Design a binder for these strands. Structure first.
Ligand SMILES: NC[C@H](Oc1noc2ccc(-c3ccccc3Cl)cc12)c1ccccc1
Ligand SMILES: NC[C@H](Oc1noc2ccc(-c3ccccc3Cl)cc12)c1ccccc1
Lengths: 479, 185, 482, 188
DNA sequence: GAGCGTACGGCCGTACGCT
DNA sequence: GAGCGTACGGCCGTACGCT
């Protein structure tokens, strides 16, 4: 027996919660939904790096679906395709070989046909993932470990943006210029009490991969203040002599389908719902770039036809900002500053933990080298101790007792090869040991003084800005 | 896509609703084909609480379920023309299972309420998914009347039920969001 | 001139396609019984150690790995080929162990590859046994980034055991499955008498043995097929007539012919009744269940003769079907129509090759190892001098030269001594080395006996086939009525 | 399914026939959309040498090709109503590419022979070692295969009509034995 | 006959929130 | 509105030879 109300409320909550925290909404730290994170981590685990050659998509999707993402091959492949489209992602995270679609909304070829790898910038998302910088968790069947979040050494949520239909809520975050973002984070990292207004001297507004125009700072400001705002995007269009004129469109609004947008214009003309348009061609080519031509009747006013086209087609589109992401595993509507603060805090954590890990590993290694030094310095006695020992277990006990060695050091000495008893090998061991002690001291300086960390972070962010920073594409027109 | 049972005595017949041909095939092997019918659906079914009536009656999955039960819908609903006295919802033990369960229950409650009242609607409890299990094990745990554990859907308060379906499955997002925040654990 | 004669283009284009479909798609190799796609799947399972002892891996993971590394074709072509190898009603000895919906006899497909998991069967280990002991030639994969096996060791005769059907260009293949026990007794008989007749072989190999069981009518078709490579074999459902109460009878069918679709076969019978084209059938139910097995019930009207209705059903439905034997496989990379004896001879010859090469490899490795152990013995026996020699040496290069000169060691032995760990200087370790060294000398002698006398080697083949027959041999299912 | 070019001057227009939407999309990006049309087919096309005329005229891929060329078929074939003066067969560099090439050539030779005579049928030569054209990027597919400055098309020339009739009937006809004989004779 | 089994391919539904 | 982007899903064509 089961009450229908109880069944509905518990069943629907299970679904809704799952769609919110593990499908449709990105984490504020690395900007990734589960499926994106699992793909990039899968690329990394099979070392499909920019230097190595493209691997078949069906191989990648199979590996990701098997080990991390127990869902449809289409859900995985299409998510990987989008990360590889230079018109979808402002900073592409996947380097594709083959038909990964066009702006006309032709899909990618099937996964049998395409090959893929990491982009150089995706290395920065994954940098130090293996230095205990982020927590791993069990995969869906408990046969594998997957990362809860990526190190994200650049601010990917705002850089690439995110759109996601959840349950009870959606997200819509526009992409940004990486240079502007990082200048924003640096500003914030020097002044915790910084205003949105001051941040906007670094972060002018969104920067779409497709370029185009944004009309005014009102929408942008409201969106960065509150997490909600409408931003008016507009095609880059001019009127030019062809003694008849024409409208030429060279940039379209973000996430607008070129083929569909042209069909809407042809349909307005077919249905006599807009007056003055004598022809409509798509002269786009990879050589010429985007070029949609609209011929205007002689002594029809072209400026009036252009204003009508904006009102009546996606040639002008609104971007409805709704900045909802997961913060400590819960969906929060966040302003520009919360998003940057949560990111900077994630970086402080990643660099601290990396340093703690490097120190741990260096100390473990220094301890082993101390054992090898003792063994090389009394090698004649060590040999006799091991020779009079009947088993490995007895030798371990005898070495520990006789020479005041740890179990880890005694194991290391029993594993030492005879070629390590030559003259140059003793010097080589003490060389490594001295460098290790300087490194351990450098690491302890960083853990001792939180401010020393910040100065180091500045220099590594600057290196990333100099290698990956790029020019704004979307013009923001005042008034 | 219906694999009907041999018996034409509704009182001892039961129909199993499953998520796809994955579960469909495993189930058709496991079942007692004398008394157990199987209707494999095609993933997420129409949310009838949000959808317009034109779309609902034209939907192919909604049509197949109406045809299978043979009761018709709304006013023309006739409990005595029912072809099964047990309609078993057998969705996976995952989150997308729970969603298809809420979507079917919404259809039954809005279009075939007397079926729920009569106690003809049940919910199987598979012990990740049952599309991944073998037929031998799927029979013994979930479909065998000797060892299985069905939950009978009981409607207690019709006013409270009307509010719950309208809140979870209705077009008003704010009530749904409020419910999630309130009940989040 | 970029100019091209239409006749030249057709002849060279079509030949490229046709040749490729024949030698690298649709026809199996006579040695391991595998088409390319099957071989690449089983080798892929083995390279990712998806073995019977380890747990089932997702099919999408397996198909992705195979498509990436070996088989540059559609995911559907690969997955469906893997599914079939996992169906106990398709493969007489399944080569893949499936978890989930891998279809039924009613012709409902397998669930999509996202839904299913798979691994090797215990018998697929026998297909792959000794693949790593230089028993078979490897070749470059399609892009030259991987090595794939040209053929599997195939330590049981898989072509005849599981059979094979394949539409090529200019030719097809249709080989029925066989009983493994009967096959191996056949090979043993042949291995003792090269001049054996087909007739004598058929005292071991009665005929085909389908996974679905059923009946074969007569030895005429079977004989013609084993003689010539072509023959029609009449298969028949196992059906009986039984009292159902009230003096009324019924026909019960418990086994259907091989590769016949149960659901489709019932629909043909219902359609004959709907269209009044067969008289006397009052009901038709499929009472098949995992408890009962296959059980199709046909109720007969009280007046009506049930034996006459059964004979009509055989004439008018797939309840009786012919299996058209067309025994074409690849022999030295070319399609050949082969009789039963050629197929068994090519198989036995493959085994002699695999075991000879394995033995040559084991001898190579054992000798290399014996040589190293001789070095380690010398080093342990004069360990005090060895240490001093290495300590007075400035570099590894000097130590290598000094050890070789001072102790009359090879470069391989000196390298082994420099690589020796300190834990090898304990008391038990010197005894362990001499134990291994003495066993190695007996093994080297056993291996040389095998390479010296082809009769010793052939007996090894016989003995290993017999071990497989005793572990994996099983009862006949298909009754051959004489 | 046809992505037509802007120019309506057949003398300077060309149509590319490709194996699927995989190659279709890569091609549509690469092409000069002023003079280069694209008709993506749907895998193996009907073998017109084996098929009955009823089935051929009802086939959706055969219909789309007839519509695209605008010449009609057989007796009603009109070379002057041709909408392209270059029909380019651009199949993948593999064995199933070669098959779709033989299947298209069989259709052209039996139903539009004067198109071949006029020298309007060509065969693109994509560089070998990519899986197909669905595996190439558009930039590279243009420069090697579609750019009139650097591409290498083969023009299909019909020399002996008697020898051609025998070759199509042998390779693509319903008689298996002549086809099998040809393969054995010409193997390696 | 029609469909067997590797190959080349394509086309349609549903939920969810926001503007 | 209608479509953005992860999720649940499904269904059809063609070659090839032989029975
Ligand atoms: N934080 C402000 C507020 O929170 C939630 N709205 O809906 C939710 C659903 C679930 C949870 C949750 C709670 C606890 C643990 C895990 C989870 Cl996922 C939190 C919220 C919000 C309202 C409106 C918009 C954005 C954010
Ligand atoms: N022995 C007659 C015949 O052989 C062939 N039919 O088609 C072929 C195509 C190619 C080759 C070949 C020859 C030499 C080198 C490499 C190759 Cl691949 C042989 C045959 C046959 C066919 C079917 C059944 C029985 C016999």
């Amino acid at each position: 027996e089961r009450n229908i109300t109880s069944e509905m409320r518990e069943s629907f909550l299970d679904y809704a919660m799952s769609v919110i925290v593990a499908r449709a909404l990105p984490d504020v730290r690395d900007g990734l939904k589960p499926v994106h994170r699992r793909i990039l981590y899968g690329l990394n685990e099979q070392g499909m790096t920019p230097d190595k050659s493209y691997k078949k998509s069906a191989r990648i999707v199979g590996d990701v679906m098997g080990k991390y993402h127990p869902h449809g091959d289409s859900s995985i492949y299409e998510a990987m395709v989008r990360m590889a489209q230079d018109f979808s992602y402002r900073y592409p995270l996947v380097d594709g070989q083959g038909n990964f679609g066009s702006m006309d909304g032709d899909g990618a070829a099937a996964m049998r046909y395409t090959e893929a790898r990491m982009t150089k910038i995706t290395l920065e998302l994954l940098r130090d993932i293996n230095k205990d910088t982020i927590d791993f968790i069990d995969n869906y069947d408990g046969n594998e470990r997957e990362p809860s979040v990526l190190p994200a050494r650049f601010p990917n949520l705002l850089a690439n943006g995110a759109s996601g239909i959840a349950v009870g809520m959606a997200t819509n975050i526009p992409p940004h210029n990486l240079t502007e973002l990082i200048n924003g984070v640096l500003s914030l990292s020097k002044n915790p009490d910084i205003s949105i207004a001051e941040l906007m001297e670094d972060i002018e507004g969104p920067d779409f991969p497709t370029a185009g125009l944004i009309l005014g700072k009102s929408g942008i400001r409201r969106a960065y203040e509150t997490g909600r705002g409408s931003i008016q995007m507009r095609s880059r269009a001019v009127i030019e002599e062809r003694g008849r004129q024409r409208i030429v469109v060279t940039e379209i609004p973000f996430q607008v389908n070129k083929a569909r947008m042209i069909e809407k214009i042809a349909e307005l003309v077919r249905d006599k719902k807009i007056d003055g348009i004598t022809d409509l061609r798509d002269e786009t080519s990879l050589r010429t770039g985007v070029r949609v031509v609209i011929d205007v009747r002689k002594d029809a006013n072209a400026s009036v036809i252009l204003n009508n086209l904006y009102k009546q087609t996606p040639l002008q589109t609104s971007f409805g900002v709704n900045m909802i992401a997961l913060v400590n595993g819960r969906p929060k509507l966040i302003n520009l500053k919360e998003a940057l603060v949560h990111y900077l805090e994630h970086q402080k954590t990643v660099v601290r933990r990396r340093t703690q890990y490097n120190l741990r590993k260096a100390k473990d290694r220094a301890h082993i080298l101390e054992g090898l030094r003792i063994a090389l310095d009394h090698i004649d006695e060590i040999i006799s101790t091991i020779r009079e020992s009947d088993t490995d277990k007895v030798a371990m006990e005898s070495l520990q007792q006789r020479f005041k060695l740890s179990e880890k050091q005694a194991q290391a000495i029993l594993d030492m090869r005879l070629r390590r008893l030559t003259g140059l090998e003793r010097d080589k061991i003490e060389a490594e040991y001295n460098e290790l002690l300087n490194y351990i001291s450098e690491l302890e300086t960083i853990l001792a003084d939180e401010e020393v960390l910040l100065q180091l972070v500045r220099d590594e962010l600057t290196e990333i800005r100099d290698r990956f920073g790029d020019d704004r594409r979307t013009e923001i027109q005042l008034g | 896509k219906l694999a009907d049972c041999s018996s034409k005595s509704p009182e001892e017949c039961e129909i199993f609703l499953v998520e796809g041909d994955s579960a469909g095939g495993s189930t058709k092997s496991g079942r007692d084909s004398r008394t157990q019918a199987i209707l494999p659906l095609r993933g997420k079914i129409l949310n009838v609480e949000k959808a317009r009536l034109d779309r609902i009656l034209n939907n192919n999955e909604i049509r197949q379920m109406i045809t299978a039960f043979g009761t018709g819908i709304g006013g023309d609903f006739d409990l005595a023309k029912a072809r099964y006295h047990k309609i078993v919802i057998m969705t996976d033990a995952d989150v997308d299972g729970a969603h298809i369960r809420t979507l079917l229950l919404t259809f039954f409650y809005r279009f075939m309420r007397p079926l729920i009242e009569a106690g003809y609607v049940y919910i199987a409890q598979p012990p990740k998914g049952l599309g991944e299990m073998n037929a031998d094990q799927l029979w013994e745990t979930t479909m065998n009347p000797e060892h299985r554990a069905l939950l009978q859907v009981k409607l207690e308060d019709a006013i409270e039920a009307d509010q719950t379906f309208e809140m979870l499955m209705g077009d008003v997002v704010e009530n749904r969001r409020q419910f999630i925040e309130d009940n989040a654990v």
